[PDB]
Design a binder for these strands. Structure first.
Length: 408
DNA sequence: TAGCACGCTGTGTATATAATAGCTATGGAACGTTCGCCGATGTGTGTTGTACATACATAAAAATATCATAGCACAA
């Protein structure tokens, strides 16, 4: 990819003594850039990752290059260990395993052999936006190499600590514009859209009488959000496109999941059921609407479903939802003549959550994506299958929300 | 006059020779029937001691957000 050689030209310029951060999309090949840099340096390279799936991907890249089984390419994890050799090495480690404090499973010595014997020379950190934390400062404080590299896709955080990475690892060298990359490769056009649904009177006065995170249980459970949600679901099913529903709250995800009758993936869920739901979403055309929480978004991103719906949201964590949204957008690439990606933000008027979703839309403006407002698409008035459209169901839902407030 | 005893009559017995008719024991082959003592040495289990792989509540980490309290500032 041209931008990858545009990033490698900086390494080809000076050669020795360099450190910086390279911003590349998730769908791009930053791991290939790490492989090329590993071929240019030829030394013990350590790749800092947070999940085993990324370790398996880096191992697949090592297989795409050459060798992995002979005593040279090592693997560090809490399950097994593998030997290494000087002058050339490729190993992937976990942040929580290298960090620690005093808990030990007779494996911290195996890491202190890679760090004690001084077999290093190249540092690779996956997702640098997570570095602003004490454990990563300890990791950097326990390592020292000749060349450092930071592979990440985003860096927008409101912790005011992203600027420290300019001296902890190095200043950002190349930031690729996702619009020009969309022109190089169709990574699904980004259509940002907020749905403005009216707010009922009872949920408005009860919403004002509530506060903190409890008023979210009155912002999400609005009947017009159920009507507009069903209208968007039936609309996308009529267009023949799969639907992914995001929710920062597990309770709302279970409510919409059970009322819509679709599979759901949330916390404390068996992994076999998660894999079954994933296979049903990949193969079965009857399941075109999935309800995914943060566990289903951080662990895996699927290239299907051009329809992304956002209902639940948390205060301040708008940039993280923009990063996950960006992961689902960049995950969809196949060079199509159309390829229209639709992001909907179900927001209710006069609520305290839309005013942060606007900050998320500001983050979506900083990336160059297109944003437009949507009050209501004509067609919901012709859907007799809408729930909570009658005053009876609205009063019953009001009583259910009041009971939910009495439980919390 | 009938059993008993005596004399008389018929039969089997052994033998060569042939005629030349049916009659039959024999060995083989095939189908249907009830039935099937103390000492020394050596094995033989079963609950269970030992043991391994996956589940699951814990520990912890890590990542973060929001009310309360002290101090400083402002008002009835």
């Amino acid at each position: 990819r041209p931008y990858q050689e545009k990033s490698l030209s900086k390494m080809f310029g000076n050669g020795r003594a360099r450190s910086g951060i390279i911003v590349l999309p998730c769908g791009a090949g930053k791991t290939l850039v790490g492989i090329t840099a590993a071929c240019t340096i030829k030394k013990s390279v350590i790749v800092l990752c947070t999940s085993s799936v990324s370790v398996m991907q880096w191992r697949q890249q090592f297989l795409x290059x050459x060798x992995x089984x002979x005593x040279x390419x090592x693997x560090x994890x809490x399950x097994x260990x593998x030997x290494x050799x000087x002058x050339x090495x490729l190993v992937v480690s976990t942040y929580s395993m290298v960090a620690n404090x005093x808990x030990x499973x007779x494996x911290x010595x195996x890491x202190x052999x890679x760090x004690x014997x001084x077999x290093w020379g190249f540092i690779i950190l996956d997702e640098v936006h997570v570095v602003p934390a004490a454990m990563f400062r300890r990791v950097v404080s326990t390592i020292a190499a000749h060349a450092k590299l930071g592979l990440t896709a985003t860096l927008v955080r409101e912790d005011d600590k992203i600027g420290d990475l300019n001296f902890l690892i190095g200043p950002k060298l190349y930031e690729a514009n996702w619009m020009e990359l969309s022109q190089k490769g169709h990574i699904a056009n980004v259509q940002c859209a907020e749905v403005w649904c009216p707010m009922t009177a009872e949920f408005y006065q009860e919403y004002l009488r509530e506060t903190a995170r409890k008023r979210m249980l009155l912002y999400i459970m609005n009947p017009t959000k159920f009507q507009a949600c069903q209208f968007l679901i039936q609309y996308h099913e009529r267009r023949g496109d799969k639907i992914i529903v995001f929710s920062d709250n597990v309770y709302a995800l279970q409510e919409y999941a059970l009322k819509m009758g679709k599979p759901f993936i949330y916390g404390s869920t068996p992994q076999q059921e998660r894999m079954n739901i994933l296979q049903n979403f990949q193969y079965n055309d009857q399941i075109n609407t999935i309800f995914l929480s943060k566990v289903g978004d951080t662990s895996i991103d699927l290239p299907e479903a051009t329809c992304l719906i956002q209902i639940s949201s948390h205060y301040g964590s708008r940039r993280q939802e923009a990063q996950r949204l960006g992961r689902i957008l960049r995950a969809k690439r196949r060079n199509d003549e159309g390829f229209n990606a639709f992001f909907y933000s179900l927001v209710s008027k006069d609520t305290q959550e839309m005013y942060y979703s606007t900050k998320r839309q500001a983050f979506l403006v900083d990336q160059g994506y297109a944003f437009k407002v949507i009050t209501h698409l004509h067609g919901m008035e012709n859907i007799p299958n809408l729930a909570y459209a009658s005053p009876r169901e609205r009063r019953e839902l009001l009583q259910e929300v009041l009971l939910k407030n009495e439980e919390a």
